[PDB]
Amino acid sequence: TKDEVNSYLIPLNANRQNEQVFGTNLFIGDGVFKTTLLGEIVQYYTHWSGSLRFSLMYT
Amino acid sequence: PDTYTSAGFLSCWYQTSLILPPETTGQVYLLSFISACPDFKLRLMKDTQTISQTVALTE
Amino acid sequence: INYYKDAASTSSAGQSLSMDPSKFTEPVKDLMLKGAPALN
Amino acid sequence: INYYKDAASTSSAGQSLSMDPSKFTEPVKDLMLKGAPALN
Amino acid sequence: GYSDRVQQITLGNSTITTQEAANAVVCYAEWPEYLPDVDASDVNKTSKPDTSVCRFYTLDSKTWTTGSKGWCWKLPDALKDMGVFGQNMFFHSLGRSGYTVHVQCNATKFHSGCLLVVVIPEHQLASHEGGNVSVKYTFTHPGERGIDLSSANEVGGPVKDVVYNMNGTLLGNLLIFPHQFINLRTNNTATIVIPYINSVPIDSMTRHNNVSLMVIPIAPLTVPTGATPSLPITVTIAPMCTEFSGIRSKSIVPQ
Amino acid sequence: GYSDRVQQITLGNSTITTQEAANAVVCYAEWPEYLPDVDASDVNKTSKPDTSVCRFYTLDSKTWTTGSKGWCWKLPDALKDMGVFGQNMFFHSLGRSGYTVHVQCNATKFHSGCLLVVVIPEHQLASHEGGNVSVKYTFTHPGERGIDLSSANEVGGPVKDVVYNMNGTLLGNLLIFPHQFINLRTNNTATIVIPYINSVPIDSMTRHNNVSLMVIPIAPLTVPTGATPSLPITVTIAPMCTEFSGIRSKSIVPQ
Amino acid sequence: TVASISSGPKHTQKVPILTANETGATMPVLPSDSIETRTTYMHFNGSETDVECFLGRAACVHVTEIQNKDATGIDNHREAKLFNDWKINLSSLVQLRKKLELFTYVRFDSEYTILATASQPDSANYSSNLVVQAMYVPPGAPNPKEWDDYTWQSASNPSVFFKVGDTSRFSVPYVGLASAYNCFYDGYSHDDAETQYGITVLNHMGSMAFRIVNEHDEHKTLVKIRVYHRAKHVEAWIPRAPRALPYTSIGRTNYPKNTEPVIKKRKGDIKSY
Amino acid sequence: TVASISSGPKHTQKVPILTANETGATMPVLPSDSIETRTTYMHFNGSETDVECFLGR
């Protein structure tokens, strides 16, 4: 509800099976993407095309 | 964001499940990053919705 | 054709067409090869 | 003489002088010769 | 002894023979071909089911009677349910295809009547409401049933007025589109080969139809005396050079 | 810095990475390949959907607990409903395929337990009734669910006794079949590549399963103190070099 | 080039005038296949029927209007025409529309000319000299809310400043998403059951916004903007039947109900001259 | 210029998609490292993202 270091953290629960960790659409100019450097630059242009690289680092 | 032009969804699920060692507890977190592949193209520059102002700034 | 004497008066510069992201994307001291293990 | 850098800024294009109505007037699979019977 | 008249088309595991053809049209004089790399954008390798999708599907038959106004099918819609063509369609994000269309109608040397068989690239229909009323999805996706131009206006459906091609242009000028006539006295089939025509290299098969096939009686059917007053018209269509790309979960579409 | 240990398998539009592998087995030292002409009989050209069928399907997960007896899946059955692989399956008269099987089970350095992962060509099951009672169809076509060897005898179903492999042979000798162990202390996955093995060049995919994949706990699962007493096991399988032939109407199978 | 060759009497077994139109072809028959002709030359190239020529002259595509007046106490500038916008589209006016819709896909660069003239319908001491500012708000850009916003700063948005009575001119590359502009589109944005139908869903290239830079004088001044568009570097594919009925909407093919017969009825018989 | 090369099935000991982000690098991974791709060309130069262009209006 207010910007926090915690919205960068995707939590994981021990022992859950089959279940879903997170979900998002890919509107790179809006939503989660919007404040990232990528999101932030994309917004200076009208059209984009290309591949995106999404990585997850485990802690 | 535009419909015709929309790009999909990204989701993540447990494939088997997180398992913590003994003497350990709670949630673990993933950090996630985004960057563009060398593939990428951006065109037709315009103004960003990410910044605005109501009076000129002074010293 | 420049009509003016000073360099500041010329039009915009022309595309770097330089482009080398490695100073930003791979500033590591020991070279990393894609496909080889990250940490040996 | 183009005074401008971008191609969109140049004047109108110049006559195709292409002209080939057969894609529209004779798109038949087996070629028809004028003078020979239409249906054999 | 080859005549323009007799023909055989074998595609996949299915063959068609006509003994009374009138040549065949190849839209814009181009034959269907796969998507070249130089024209490619999506980086995905595509899937080319070949003979399992490139065979002839015969849609259900229509009945030409003296009151018929004409019928309209959209592609790839008409085939949305045919065998593996259809499955591939709902399961990939993008697909591309050309077709061979074979329209059949035989009678006797005492009948008269003449149908126009035409293929219209990007046939955007008009709402019969006027103004800027849209034509809902379901209405432009009739499936194998196609649209029956002598059916009644419905709400959210297109206008079905024949002398206006369902779009504000006159029936008489449809001849600028690849087409062929079936004149009972001459002809008994019409065959058109359709190359893939779009402004993008590959597209969605469900949100956009790229041709409407239209069969329209123009010289009314006239049967011999005390003949039954009607003839069936059958449409058989075969996807050719089909490619699918961006496989996943399987689209869910309205209705 | 390549280890036997880390691996990547990319097949179609899907990729698997393991950081704790124990090499991989290729049944009988042969890698899946298409059907050569010299071996062909049916004259039909076959369909090779390629990347739309040769990708990785992850079946639903199992739960290894201290009481588990083992699970059994049949191929191509287990995949009868996965994406376009499955459609092709019900729609052609004949089909043929090899697979990459990747079984996954991770734990920690305090757990113990060891699973046997084995592929048995032509695993004809036994009726628990004895005599010459048959094993009904449905029972040998469990689909993605597979057979749970610790479930109860049912009527018309197979026997589920583990030390007899469901056929009158001893568990101990299953090691003559291509197999790999998952020993929590070593291993976290098992990967086996299965070439197509049959006495005919191509067969029906619905009346005959050509391998059973079997995962059997052998050294019981032992979790660290006050750990939850169970681990999930996941099976992901990818058809490879698949070919379908004799397309038609679409099989209807019991139940 | 010969327009007609010389040809004399014929008594053949080779009849070029009998054909079978059922085939879909238009056989290339000439005067000399059926009468006796003399040589004549063409003297003509077909220059002025080139599609570049046909679509290459400026056409009026839009007329809007804005006014210069005291904005003091105006709660909605947009609504007071303190500034307007034109949601870029070439379907508005039908003169240029019919021409374009002769084709299915079209690709070209645009050259815009913008003429602005002022009117002072009620008592003014004079005619002031106003400066117009036309800025193209690409879709996904901060839309001007006021007439002296931060948006008008247009630091990344191409904008032009010209005087009323004068004209502004520039040209734009083809900014289409695809390989060409879709004159028609028999599809939807997505597989919805209520989503719109047509091109109006495909042609979403933002809008243009005008405004007067000058503050307000004692009188009010009406400025009326006319946008002209000229296609240059034209490429057109797939000819279609010309538009017969009147237009009702930007982007749909819809025609009005109880329209009138478009084919002129004979005053007389089929036999009449 | 190719935007993507053609690439097919992989079953290797050489995994380009596993990295260690703690190092500070962004490893140059491409679509063809993890799916099967077909050749496609760029058709584009990145002209309008040059800093001269970005700050030049």
Ligand SMILES: Cc1cc(CCCCCOc2c(Cl)cc(C3=NCCO3)cc2Cl)on1
């Ligand atoms: C079909 C079809 C074609 C078009 C034309 C689209 C217009 C594209 C954007 O064009 C402009 C650009 Cl790039 C800049 C300016 C502009 N820059 C400073 C002032 O105006 C105006 C326009 Cl319309 O619309 N439907």
